[PDB]
């Protein structure tokens, strides 16, 4: 089959790679690694990618450096072992060109990004380490515009799925996002993690129940509520992008759910069986 | 006489560095935003020729620390700072010295006042583009020790910073400056009204395309600035949140509040060295001095 | 030396600046507007009041277009209502000020002695032009300094570039008179820069979203002139002023800037650009020059 | 017959009212009074008016004060007897409103002007004194925009003629303009007045010959050359206004031509007999 054929959603905080992880971090990390094995078994030509931690407020930026690599010390977690992250990413910059072109054809400002020293976000590095330790996948990444409407990001998602079809690619979509963002303002130990604020846990589970039942358009109808009351990562526009990219079809398989330093975190997949 | 000899509102949009074509910045412009850059030249001379500080303490919004308030105590930060949203405007090679003793004192005082804090000592962490831009505009010679403070906020759900915690951090900064005998100038690097173009003009520095986002944002900026240039700073304590609510001001990051609190809310007027717009956002360069 | 002319200023007169201030003498009322330029004028006002402390303000403006030579207003106490014919909704100004008649008579005498066609106006029924009133209000709204108003030699039926050579003669005539009479004077050259403007007024005149450079070409040329003003001496401006007129239709074609710089002896000094901004698209700069 | 039925062009410099005029000033003044008597005999309901000395650079301003009156001292000729000028003018402000509405409907900025102390230009004052000493005409006046294209003023004139027809008015058009503007930059005596510059007198007679021959178009075609080479008052856009108002039809009658302090000046009329 051509086009977008699989989808996955996973958290992106570096705690998933901790040497001494909280039980929830190791469960989320293990689920992510499982999703990665399934994704690589699908053998997609390209994986469209959006991580909330590469954000923008001006147009839609696309990663056009074919091979960013190096070491990244996260600006927040430098003091922990999981704050030091190595990365070596391969981007299909030519499919990215087709996708950026489709976005410009839709009236949006597509911005090619190829600069030495351009910052690489922690979410993308963590996702590569969990889903693709051997760097087999070829990514196509767009920024997460926080300024324009969430539906414009859905439009960019629709443009990506159309480009994948025009290019004859077997592609998947991966979005790196948290759920509720109730961060614990303390230097906690791994054993004392928890959902951070009242009502956040119920909100995450409500959203997760709807997605596991294939009721995606109903999470999108309540997205703004989820964002306001549970401080969902980037107003959960990562889901709007994934839905736009035809990636969230059918029932969602919940692989794991738990807290990361107060935030809500879940590993989900669409159309990613074990076989 | 207070150890903090001046506090400045020192916005950091990369367009201002881009327009100056400094050696440290890789991209090159044909100019732009001249009046704001000339106002900064005035501030630079004030810092260099009048205040003569032992240290520049800068608080900016883009080093967002999700847990508490961090202090950069790296002795000699160096690296390449690329502005992710405007990489065509700002790719800055930086190299400066930190007043480690002061930064450690600030962290110590802030924790003593009840804030969650951390001292950054890993030189592999890249300094954020807003801190670099602010420091370049205040002193492009980089020959004054620096203490860089992070901005407490939520990077996954950006919100109005806790202005109360920023007042606490300001007191922590004053205590540390006094305890260490330093002569300091503070840099609160926030823009004002923060709604901007969703499309960049074909030529970034096309000044025909540079104007207020709308008159509502402009008039609210003017209301804040009029209060600044006239009465004491104490009323700004309530006007700042009001202006934030009406304009989405970048002062919601809290740097302006931090600095004014550090100065003890002096009963003085601010000297508005310049105001202009950058992709529609309001930008004011202001200097406050202690009473007397 | 210690010249009689203690300062010379480029002091543009667009009625929007008076309108935005809402002074008591002006009938129409605004909601603000053009704040940064008005704030710059406040700085110039304090420079005149608190530092220069002149005996007389000598102003030259373009719109009193006298078609036969150069006229000097020697009316002892000009008073009346000044209505801007193109912007009557912005500027209807009730003026009342005192003239330094002796200096005015000496300026005209020195001017005729240098070969200029001159005339002394003594009829109090003649209305002082709206640009002279605007310039003087912006330079000193207290009207407590004697004045000498000079007219602008041009053709009211086929407007052209004023003979800049003639204006240099008028400048020397002005210098000779100030020295001969022992006056301490501040000169006001009331010209805007680039002078292409909107063909249509915005619904709200002070809607600052609609206030921006006519185009980037006009802006860049203003910047070229201002940067030369900010660095090198003034004598090279003699050659740059005509080029900037040809490129932007600058109001400096009226010759007031040339007159003032020549009256100051083309001092080997930089100009202090207190402020630059646009008014219905035209370039407007407030600048102060001081003796060597 | 409704609409614009007559037209006239006269100079506006106050020298026409001099107590001790040069022969040319007097001839032009008498020519103006002649046109005035012919105009008032025509009994127009309203006279559309454009004077080059009420100029603008922003939209098109209309005189909406029904009765400006007072005494005016010219800022250039105050020292001479003709620099003191009294005026009492009546404007048909309601027709002016219709005219302004038509200009606004045409996509142009029509600006209604009614303010105490608004300056009244010397050209309009001189024209009223010569054409209408008893203040019996009712004027409708628009500014002379110098910044917009000259053809925008032709559109304003066309709108005024259309409005007069819609209102059922019998109207005339008067334009107050100089010709060449090579002014003598010297305090001369009346006896030594002369066209100021070379080529100005030849350029003036050239357009007058065409106008008297009913060739207004060929004047409009060379209007820009006339403006550049002879410094024609306001690029002679006053003629573009009159032509747009359909007031310059048929042969023009040349009542007088001569210099005024170096400038060229002429009194012309279209369809004003007797
Ligand atoms: Fe910023
Ligand atoms: Fe002017």
Residue numbers in the entry:
A (entry chain A): 4 to 278
B (entry chain B): 31 to 322
C (entry chain D): 30 to 321
D (entry chain C): 4 to 277
What does the original paper state about this entry?
We have discovered a new cluster of genes that is found exclusively in the Actinobacteria phylum. This locus includes genes for the 2-aminophenol meta-cleavage pathway and the shell proteins of a bacterial microcompartment (BMC) and has been named aromatics (ARO) for its putative role in the breakdown of aromatic compounds. In contrast, the 2-AP ring cleavage is catalyzed by 2-AP 1,6-dioxygenase (AmnAB), which oxidizes substrates with an amino group adjacent to a hydroxyl group. First, based on the co-occurence of a putative 2-AP 1,6-dioxygenase, which is suggested to catalyze the benzene ring cleavage of 2-AP (herein referred to as ARO dioxygenase), with shell proteins, the ARO BMC is the first metabolosome predicted to be involved in the degradation of aromatic substrates. Our results show the ability of recombinant ARO dioxygenase to interact with either catechol or 2-AP substrates and convert them into aldehyde intermediates, which are then detoxified by the ARO AldDh.
